[PDB]
A paper describes a structure:
Three highly related Salmonella effectors, SseK1, SseK2, and SseK3, orthologues of the enteropathogenic and enterohemorrhagic Escherichia coli T3SS effector NleB1 (7), translocate via the T3SS into the host cell. Similarly to NleB1 (9, 10), SseK1 and SseK3 are N-acetylglucosamine (GlcNAc) transferases that modify the TNFR1-associated death domain protein TRADD and inhibit activation of the pro-inflammatory transcription factor NF-κB, as well as necroptotic host cell death. Here we report the structure of the Salmonella arginine N-glycosyltransferase, SseK3, in its apo and ligand-bound forms.
Attempts to solve the structure by molecular replacement using available glycosyltransferase X-ray structures or selenium SAD phasing failed. Instead, we recorded data at the I23 long-wavelength beamline at Diamond Light Source to reveal the positions of the selenium and sulfur atoms within SseK3 based on the small anomalous signals present at long wavelengths to obtain an initial model. This model was used as template in a molecular replacement search with a complete 2.21 Å resolution data set that did not exhibit severe diffraction anisotropy. that overlap with a root mean square deviation (RMSD) (Cα of residues 27–328) of 0.91 Å. The structure of apo-SseK3(14–333) is reported in Fig. 2A. As suggested by solution NMR spectroscopy, the C-terminal residues are disordered in the unbound SseK3 structure, with structural reorganization following primary substrate binding, with an open-close catalytic cycle that, as in the case of a number of other glycosyltransferases, is likely to support SseK3 enzymatic activity. UDP-GlcNAc hydrolysis is not observed with SseK3(14–333) or in the absence of enzyme, indicating that together, the C-terminal residues Trp-334 and Arg-335 are necessary for SseK3 functional activity.
Numbering used by the authors: 26 to 332
Amino acid sequence: SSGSANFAGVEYPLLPLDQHTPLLFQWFERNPSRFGENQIPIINTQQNPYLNNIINAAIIEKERTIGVLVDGNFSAGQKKALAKLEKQYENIKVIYNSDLDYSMYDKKLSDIYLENIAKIEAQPANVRDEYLLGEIKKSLNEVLKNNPEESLVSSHDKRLGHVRFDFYRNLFLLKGSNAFLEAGKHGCHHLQPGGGCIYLDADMLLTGKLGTLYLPDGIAVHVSRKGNSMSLENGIIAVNRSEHPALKKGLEIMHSKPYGDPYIDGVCGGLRHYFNCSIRHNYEEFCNFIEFKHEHIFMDTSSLTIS
């Protein structure tokens, strides 16, 4: 009726993401002291003009709510600078990650390990992952000895680098438009409960309005191409509704896999299971089917050099 896309002998209707589906940027700062005590604690050099890229997207998309999910040990003056950024740009909403309740998506590590110890033991010995079974029992022992209430959220709260960003990115997108309402952001134009969200990496420059997008079952992700290879990525994630069952599938993998990675399993694994991009299927065909394509999204150029 409004479009249709085919992958692995299954039809997926192209579902619309209206022009008021909010945009999401994410800045988790590990050293806020590198910025001045009265500066917006987002990197903004000429190598990484991330704050400028976020503003330019907010300037282009006037009517659309622009979300910025932040985290870190910011000084009081840095939070006022962020508070003033929300004042200069009416559509910019700064959401602190600590203000959101993710407990409904959480699971105890001891629960995951026990399930897998039972699951692997039921497999005959000639097929059991013997190395993994010992590792899980080892992981369970350390949880019971050091932090028996450790959960996916608490364990990921302690990690460093991208794995903790990627973790909360998937969870925010499951909240979707509700996250802005939960965070108490007033006046978000046409923001509806149950609505979707469009995450964009901060090193990408939006040069024109996205308009209305039409994505298979209302989801699409970035597909990066390096050399002669392509790969599913989380640099762009667009969903047309909250709790999108594909992202929910990625979380379900996190709840059943012993050492689930928020990127490999929460995004790539969830997408491949959801659309049946099996090991025997054409990964290249899936990439073209699921790829977020838009003329007005521009890749970072500062990356580049001779060759």
